[PDB]
Amino acid sequence: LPRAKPLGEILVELGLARPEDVEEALQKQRRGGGRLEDTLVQSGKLRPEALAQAVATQLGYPYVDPEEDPPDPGAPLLLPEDLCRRYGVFPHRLEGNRLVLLMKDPRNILALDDVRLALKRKGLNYEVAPAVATEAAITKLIERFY
Amino acid sequence: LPRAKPLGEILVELGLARPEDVEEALQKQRRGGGRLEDTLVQSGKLRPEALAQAVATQLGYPYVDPEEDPPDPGAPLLLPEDLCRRYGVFPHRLEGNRLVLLMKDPRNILALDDVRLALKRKGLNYEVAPAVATEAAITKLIERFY
Amino acid sequence: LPRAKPLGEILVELGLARPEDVEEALQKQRRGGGRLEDTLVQSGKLRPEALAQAVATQLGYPYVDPEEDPPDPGAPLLLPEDLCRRYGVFPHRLEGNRLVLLMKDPRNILALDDVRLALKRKGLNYEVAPAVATEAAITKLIERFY
Amino acid sequence: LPRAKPLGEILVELGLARPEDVEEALQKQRRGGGRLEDTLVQSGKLRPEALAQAVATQLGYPYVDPEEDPPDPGAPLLLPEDLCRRYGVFPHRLEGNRLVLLMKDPRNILALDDVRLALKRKGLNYEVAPAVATEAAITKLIERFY
Amino acid sequence: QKDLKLGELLLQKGWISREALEEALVEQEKTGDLLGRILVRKGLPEEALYRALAEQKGLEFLESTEGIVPDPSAALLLLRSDALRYGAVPIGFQNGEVEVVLSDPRHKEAVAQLLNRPARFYLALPQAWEELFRRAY
Amino acid sequence: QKDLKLGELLLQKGWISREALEEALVEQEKTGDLLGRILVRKGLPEEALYRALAEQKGLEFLESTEGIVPDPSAALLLLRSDALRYGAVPIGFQNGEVEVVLSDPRHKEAVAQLLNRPARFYLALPQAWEELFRRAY
Amino acid sequence: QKDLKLGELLLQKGWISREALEEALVEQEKTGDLLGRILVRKGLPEEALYRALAEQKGLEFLESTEGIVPDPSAALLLLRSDALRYGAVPIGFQNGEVEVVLSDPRHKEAVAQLLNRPARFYLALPQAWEELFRRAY
Amino acid sequence: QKDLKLGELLLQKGWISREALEEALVEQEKTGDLLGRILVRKGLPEEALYRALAEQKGLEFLESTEGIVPDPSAALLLLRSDALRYGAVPIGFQNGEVEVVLSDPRHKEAVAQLLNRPARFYLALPQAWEELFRRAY
Amino acid sequence: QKDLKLGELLLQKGWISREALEEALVEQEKTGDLLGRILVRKGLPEEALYRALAEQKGLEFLESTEGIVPDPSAALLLLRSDALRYGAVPIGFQNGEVEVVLSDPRHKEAVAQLLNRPARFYLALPQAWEELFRRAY
């Protein structure tokens, strides 16, 4: 969350997609069980990089590259490795009750609410600021910093 | 799968083994129910030289001495020792999701299947980046790290 | 450990028991039920360290001193303390299927079968190389590493 | 093990105490529950070293000074710290199964037996090779090597 | 000078023809180039030599020109023709690092080349060496 | 010194026209100027450059001076024109490294700033540097 | 010049007579020849020689030369006639050390030959080393 | 010269007749020779003394010289005719420190002797040494 | 010279008029006296200064000289005029801990006075700090 535009549709606005790719991928996730945010590329339509830059855009947030952006260690310890791995997310900047969460899919509310609960156990009452990254880059970020 | 050029006969075609050894290996099939591949080496019939070139020939593999080739110390934990020694295999350098798995016979699909599952259940995504080597040297290498 | 020179041959070479001592002690086993190497320590002809000199001399093996020869860190799990106390051994360098043994118990038949089975129970195929080790010192290598 | 001449008058023959002092102290321990070795000390009749020395003569276990008598560290692992403090004893050279046990009074059979068993549960079948020392030096030795 | 007889293993393994061994071995003692390298293309698939080097010498087993990346920062350290006979391309550079990838670390005539700085041997084909030199030398 | 291929992320991450890279690469190759500052304005946005250099050199992209706050430890001695022209300020410390914000980490005259102490270098746009000029001193 | 005395342990083990020790020792000290080496033939049996030498020096007892094959390069650190006098042959190189296949660790005249490398010491019957001396040079 | 009260510790540990101490101490105080070697034979066994001398210096008293093997090499230049009078020999090298076994560590000129290797000092009895040295070299 | 900038925090928390900042900075360069000490008088209401400064250096926001008693020995170290432009008369004087309560840890030219040994900083109202001189020199 926030609710977001469809990923495929923001890719259309960005010149990165046709609405045809959006709806076809959407029909795929309706049967596949994954998200539009996954099927735009799993359906073989839109570039995963495009998807990655675009999901935070879909929410009004920036593209943040995991191999660049500093994974402030408090953040991966704030939100546990298993929990991060589980949603395809990786924690970054902290402030007050805030956490920047670098996600392959910023729309993924499972992270944000299970993250919320983890953050609260640590002492932050949530206020996540989703940001988006290439899944592989956060995979490597997840592998490297807990 | 894997497919390509069956190990039994090529062990022989290389001038490194007799068709009689493929057959004795096949006798293990008759006395156990496995495949040629498997038995060519598991029952000890076709020469290790035959396997060094033939396994490599059937599917496309390198051959390397495990005592010297950088036996990436974290890779041994990717495949717990009994799931490693029973199949004549050893994890070398990791390449992201990929493992340079050094094995007595990378075409021995029974042994390989037990290992592959271990390399996904205990290991990486397997995505093997494989090589061939005698079981003895591989076993010595396995023992050094576990 | 494998079986080779029949103890009296080497106890004599070694100055540990003369042809006369190996015969007298062996006569003890007409009721005792043991072997020449056992009877020699039972009869007071040999010290267990003398048997150690014999187990290697028997085979042509080294003076693996318990305080000098490296106790390969995986080796004690291979040949457990329980085993070690039974045969007066300590595993050292592992070689795939093979094992170097700090050792006391000469030739015998039981020492072979039992060290071997006690080993297969946990790991390797025995294929061993007993080496001379003073028993007091053998005990310390066992205690310090299992 | 230790067996003993009376501490009582060996102290007299040694020129350390009068038969009056050793019997008085002997009658004290008779009710007190301690040993003559303690009551001569408690009563101010003899120095612990005088008694320790006398005990060496009494039992045939020479006076030894714990500060330097080689406290082979394995021996402290073999015979526990509390077990030591409990009896006024400290383990030293190990040989086969044999343990040099430096005792305030090697007549302390309870210690010898409890130690026998403790050492066996840790590694050796015992056979004490006792010596005697000033308990304070032993105590300091216990503090030094556990 | 010594190893597990670099290049002879190949015959044992069916990697080379008998003729490849006999010619290359005569050339070995005659010229100073060593059997390992000399055998390539004498009845020796180059890869098979790398299988043998990976086994007889223990060099890290690397890849062909479609695998191993050229880099003049280091390739310029050794002449392409001699380097091809030697069997190596030095690749890449950090103040504290150069990789040397070599087909014949037996080479009595010139084995000591390249690894004279924070570097170690890796293993890959002449196919790569020539192309990687032409692409960066 | 190694990097992750300056110019390639720019294309691969959708940051530039290929033209920015090819013209710039050629100028690096032919004039000796450095690809980082050469790339911008060739079909490359300034933001786009810095994000590529950030990733490629193991460095970090910086946002405006709401983010790039100058460090007075140097900034009060530093002329405002140094903050602008190197596009750089030495900042705080971490581990033993002190941050160097830069107009271009490939542009070693600017990476030189700070290096009395170890450093990670950081990157930003001409306007970040003009705003830093305006606020730092 | 160190062991648990060449000759002495052989004596203690019942392998030699004192007189054999001394004849062999005198030549060792006088001519530079060797006590262990000389003791065999002067009344000492060979495996018995080696068993004490193993305990005197800390040696690993070996097999014949169809097992103990000499090193194409290290073997020339001590030639057949030097190896014979020495009671040793140099083989291999690991962690800086060369293996020494001894018949006798004290070579008074020139134990330094061979030990042109740090070394690990080994031991065996003269039949093995005799052939090895010939194989060495 | 000085140590942790030789004489008080000797009396406390049952090592000396008080007579040994007072005569020996006064002799040190009046002549400059040292209490240690002065005390033995004055009502003090050498064993009793050397245990005290070692304790009070932070050095260690060693077992009967029957078991104390002299360094095999150093002994060649410290033969019976030399070693018997000193009552001392350095032994081996305990990885990093030789056991320099003296006849009296109160003499700084004694710990200086035999000190050809990094060391800790040890102590053993000259009567016992005479029997060993007589036997050994 | 690191801080959160006196004059800027002061404006941010309603502590000064903007003009206090601007004129005090001029006087702070033209006379060289601390900005802060100058700001009080140029339009800063006392406490307002110290609270900003305490934020600037991460200092304790303190009480008066009832508790914060100066050191006359230390006071006589500096000409009181040096201490006054500096912005404090020192409290204590340890080799790694002079206690200082400066009127402006930001002002790079007068802040550099007094600390012959580094200070640990704390800070309260100017009434206290000027009293600090009355109580010491």
Helix (H), strand (E), coil (C) string for chain I: CCCCCCCHHHHHCCCCCHHHHHHHHHHHHHCCCCHHHHHHHHCCCCHHHHHHHHHHHCCCECCCCCCCCCCHHHHCCCCHHHHHHHCCCCEEEECCEEEECCCCCCCCCCCCCCCCCCEEECECCHHHHHHHHHCCC
Q: Which of C141, C136, C142, C135 is nearest to C52 (CA)?
A: C135
Instruction: Compute the 3-state secondary structure of chain F and give helix, strand, coil in percent, each to the nearest 5.
Output: 45, 15, 40
Q: Does F1 touch chain E (CB under 8 A)?
A: yes
Query: How far apart (Å, rounded) are the C-alpha atoms in residues F113 and F124?
Result: 15
- Type of residue found at E115: L
CB E35 within 8 A of CB E25: yes
Chain I nearest CA to F76, separation (Å): 7
Give dist(CA E62, CA E49) in Å, integer.
12
In this complex, do D96 and C143 lie within 8 Å of one another by their Cβ atoms? no
F5 touching E (Cβ < 8 Å): no
Three-state DSSP at F121 gives strand
Tell me the one-letter amino acid at A90. F
Helix (H) or strand (E) holding G44: none
SS3 H93: strand
Q: Which of D74, D96, D123 sits opposite C135 (nearest CB)?
A: D96
Q: Which of A44, A66, A43, A56 is nearest to A7 (CA)?
A: A56
Our CA dihedral for C90, C95, C97, C98, rounded to 10 degrees, sits at -50
Find, among D110, D49, D47, D45, the residue nearest to D83 by Cα: D110
Distances from the Cα of E117 to the Cα of A112, C133, E106, E110, E112, angstroms = 51, 45, 19, 16, 11
The DSSP H or E segment spanning C131 is: strand C128-132
Residue D22, amino acid: V
Distance in Å, alpha carbon of A53 to nearest chain F alpha carbon: 9
Beta strands E119-123 and E97-102, pairing class = parallel
DSSP strand E in chain D: where? 89-95, 98-103, 131-132
Q: Are D82 and D127 in contact (CB under 8 A)?
A: no
Residue G27 CB burial class (10 angstroms; 0-12, 13-18, ≥19): middle
Q: How many helical (H) and strand (E) elements, i.e. helices and strands, does chain A have? A: 8, 3
Contacts of C144 in chain D (CB under 8 A): 74
| Alpha carbons H70 and F52: distance in angstroms, whole number | 71
Q: In chain G, how long is the greatest CA-to-CA distance?
A: 41
- CA F136, distance to chain mean position in Å, is 17
Q: Of B130, B38, B122, whose CA–CA distance to B90 is shortest?
A: B130
Q: E57 to chain B nearest CA, in Å?
A: 8
Question: Helix, strand or coil for residue C123?
Answer: coil
Which helix H or strand E contains C99, and what residues bound it? strand C98-103
- Helix C48-57 to helix G46-53 angle, to the nearest 10 degrees? 120
How many CB atoms sit inside 10 A of residue C78's CB? 20
How are beta strands E119-123 and E60-61 bridged, if at all?
A: parallel
Torsions phi, psi for B141 (to 5 deg): -65, -40
C93's enclosing H/E stretch is strand C89-95
> What are the start-end ranges of the E strands in chain E?
60-61, 88-94, 97-102, 119-123
CA–CA separation, F87 and F109 (whole Å): 10
Distance CA E50, CA C139 (A): 47
Contacts of G71 in chain E (CB under 8 A): 2
Report how far residue H12's alpha carbon sits from residue H19's, in angstroms, rounded to the nearest whole number: 14
Which of F6, F134, F5, F122 is CA-nearest to residue F59? Answer: F122
Whether E93 has its CB under 8 Å from any CB of chain B: the answer is no
- Torsion sign over Cα F114, F116, F122, F123: positive
Q: What's the rounded Cα separation, in Å, for the pair I31 and I107?
A: 12
**CB-CB under 8 Å, A67 with F55:** yes
The nearest CA of chain D is from the CA of H61 a distance in Å of 6
Chain C environment of G55 (Cβ under 8 Å): 63, 132
Q: Which of A1, A104, A18, A13 shows the shortest CA–CA distance to A53?
A: A104
- The beta strands (E) that lie in chain A are given as 89-95, 98-103, 128-132
- Is the separation of the CB atoms in B68 and B133 below 8 Å? no
Q: What are the tokens at F68?
A: 């790039």
Other Cβ atoms within 10 Å of H40 Cβ, number: 23
**Beta carbons of H77 and H53 less than 8 angstroms apart:** no
Cβ neighbours of residue B43 under 8 Å, at least 6 residues apart? B24, B25, B27, B28
Instruction: Tell me how far CA of residue E111 lies from CA of B68, E34, E105, E117, in angstroms.
Output: 19, 9, 5, 15
Token pair belonging to B14: 């290389």
Q: Which of G10, G20, G13 is nearest to G42 (CA)?
A: G20
Cα(A31)–Cα(B134) distance, integer angstroms: 47
Determine the distance from the C-alpha atom of residue B10 to the mean position of all C-alpha atoms in its chain, rounded to a whole number: 16
Residue whose entry in the numeric block shows the structure tokens 């293996």:
G99
Report d(CA D75, CA D79) in Å as an integer.
6
The DSSP code for A107 is: T
- The residues that bridge with C101 in the sheet, in sequence order, are C91, C130
- Burial class (CB within 10 angstroms; exposed 0-12, middle 13-18, buried 19+) of I57: middle
Residues of chain F neighbouring I108 (CB-CB closer than 8 A): 76-77
I30 touches chain F (CB under 8 A): no
CA distance C92 to chain D (A): 20
> Measured between alpha carbons, how far is D60 from D69 in angstroms, rounded to an integer?
17
Which tokens in the block code for residue H98?
Answer: 């030789």
Tell whether the torsion through CA atoms of B54, B57, B59 and B63 is positive or negative.
positive
CA C1 to chain centroid, in Å, comes to 7
What the block records as the tokens of F2 is 């190694």
CB pairs under 8 A between D and H: 20
Q: How was this structure determined?
A: cryo-EM
Residues of H within 8 A of D68 (CB-CB) are 51, 54-55, 60-61
Q: What share of chain B is helix, strand, coil (3-state, %, to 5)?
A: 50, 10, 40
| Phi, psi (rounded to 5 degrees) for B89 | -125, 155
C121 CB-near residues (< 8 Å, 6+ apart): none
Contact G59, G78 (CB under 8 A): no
| Gap between the Cα atoms of A51 and A132, Å rounded | 9
Residues I62 and I122 sit within 8 Å (Cβ to Cβ): yes
The encoded tokens of residue C86 equal 């039974």
Nearest to A76, CA basis, from A136, A12, A3, A143: A143
Q: How far apart are CA A90 and CA A92, in angstroms?
A: 7
CB contact at 8 A, E89 and E71: no
Helix (H, G, I), strand (E, B) or coil at F62: coil
Alpha helices in H56-124 (DSSP H): 80-86, 108-111
Beginning with the edge strand found earlier in the chain, give each strand of the sheet holding I91-94 in spatial order.
Answer: I91-94, I97-100, I119-121
Structure tokens at A47: 């570039």
F87 within 8 A of F110, measured Cβ to Cβ: yes
Closest to A115 (Cα-Cα) out of A139, A132, A133, A98: A98
Beta strands E119-123 and F60-61 are: unpaired
* Cα(C81)–Cα(G109) distance, integer angstroms: 46
Whether H69 and chain G come into contact, CB under 8 Å, resolves to yes
C62:G61 CB<8 A: yes
Angle between helices C135-145 and C48-57 (to 10 degrees): 90
Q: Reported resolution in A?
A: 8.0
Q: What is the CA radius of gyration of chain C?
A: 14
Q: Report the 10 Å Cβ neighbour count for I73.
A: 12
The C-alpha R_g of chain H, in whole angstroms, comes to 15
What is the rounded distance in angstroms from the CA atom of residue F106 to the CA atom of residue F53?
8
Contact H48, H15 (CB under 8 A): yes
Nearest CA-CA partner of F83 in F34, F49, F131, F121: F131
**Residues E83 and E133: beta-carbon distance below 8 Å:** yes
Q: Which two tokens stand for residue H55?
A: 């304790």
In contact, G89 and G100? CB cutoff 8 Å? yes
Pairing of β H60-61 and β H89-94: unpaired
